[PDB]
Amino acid sequence: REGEIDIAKRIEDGINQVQCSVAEYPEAITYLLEQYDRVEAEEARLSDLITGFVIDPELAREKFAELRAQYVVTRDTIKHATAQEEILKLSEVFKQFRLVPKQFDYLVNSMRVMMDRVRTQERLIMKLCVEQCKMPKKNFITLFTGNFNAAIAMNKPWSEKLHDVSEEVHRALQKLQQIEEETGLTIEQVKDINRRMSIGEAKARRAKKEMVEANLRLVISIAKKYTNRGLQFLDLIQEGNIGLMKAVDKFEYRRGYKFSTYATWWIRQAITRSIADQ
């Protein structure tokens, strides 16, 4: 099972990477400082909010007071490696939170939709340009990594064609600025960190797609025995495979088991129940 460990360590590398990448968002600190106080006001519970740390609510109180003190020193680091040392310190305390699955899911899809917030503008401006300009797009890449607040006179004939859209372009600058100020962060940094978490999840899913073909043997062998229960081989393999997938995200690989030896505990759960359904 040494290949299993090679895969699982890259999995945990990817999840550490997405954790430290989402940890860079400062408004997540406000969110969690609301969350823990909802717990402390008996309207929420920590067992649904935090599973562990890197259980006691007093250590959580300590950590959340640390995170509040880190958010204030995030506020005063307006100055730009001065913010970088502080954001690394904030990631230091953030990576010590083994958050509940659903809460982290809320966080990551929140990051996804706030990335989409700038995504819509970055797309629509392009569809406005690419219709009529025949433009120096290869240099629009540079122009947009920079940020039309200054670039009107592009000294070509198409510098007139941008005047057909310039009003809607400036409206797009207004919306871009309002979304830029709403997050309290530079849009470029958000693009980078969202790229980072996307790459972490992509690498994890990659290794998952290697793993599924690595572990077809157990599901094939169990389905081959379960054929006679009134179903085909070709859907019992699906039940065993999705059971394996459920086993993936909950395998404590440091336990020394072969992961296959785990999946059966759910494959039996997945097949014998599916025979009940079909």
Partner: protein, 100 residues
């Protein structure tokens, strides 16, 4: 008559395979690559965005994962009939004919 609500989009074979392929001729994309797209043998980017990926460019399996590392979510590519439906719905008919 009845109707089956297909869980996913599906390319009509009469407009894809009857030669000359209407889907390909409309998209200006050769038939041999459209077959690879809507039979899950390749990808195609519905939009490149701020990325050197042309809207009609096909990508093989690992290139999609590779172009992820290089550009993240700046571009967007799909496979199967969803991608072809997106490429179809995305195009501007009257602008395309006035340009051609």
């Amino acid at each position: 008559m009845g109707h089956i609500e297909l869980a996913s989009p599906t390319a009509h074979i009469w407009f894809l395979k009857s030669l000359p392929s209407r889907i390909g001729l409309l998209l200006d994309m050769p038939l041999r690559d459209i077959e690879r797209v809507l039979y899950f043998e390749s990808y195609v980017v519905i939009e490149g965005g701020m990325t050197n990926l042309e809207r009609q460019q096909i990508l093989t399996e690992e290139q999609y994962l590779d172009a992820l590392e290089e550009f993240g979510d700046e571009f967007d590519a799909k496979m199967g009939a969803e991608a072809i439906q997106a490429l179809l719905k995305s195009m501007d008919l009257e602008q395309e004919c006035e340009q051609l």
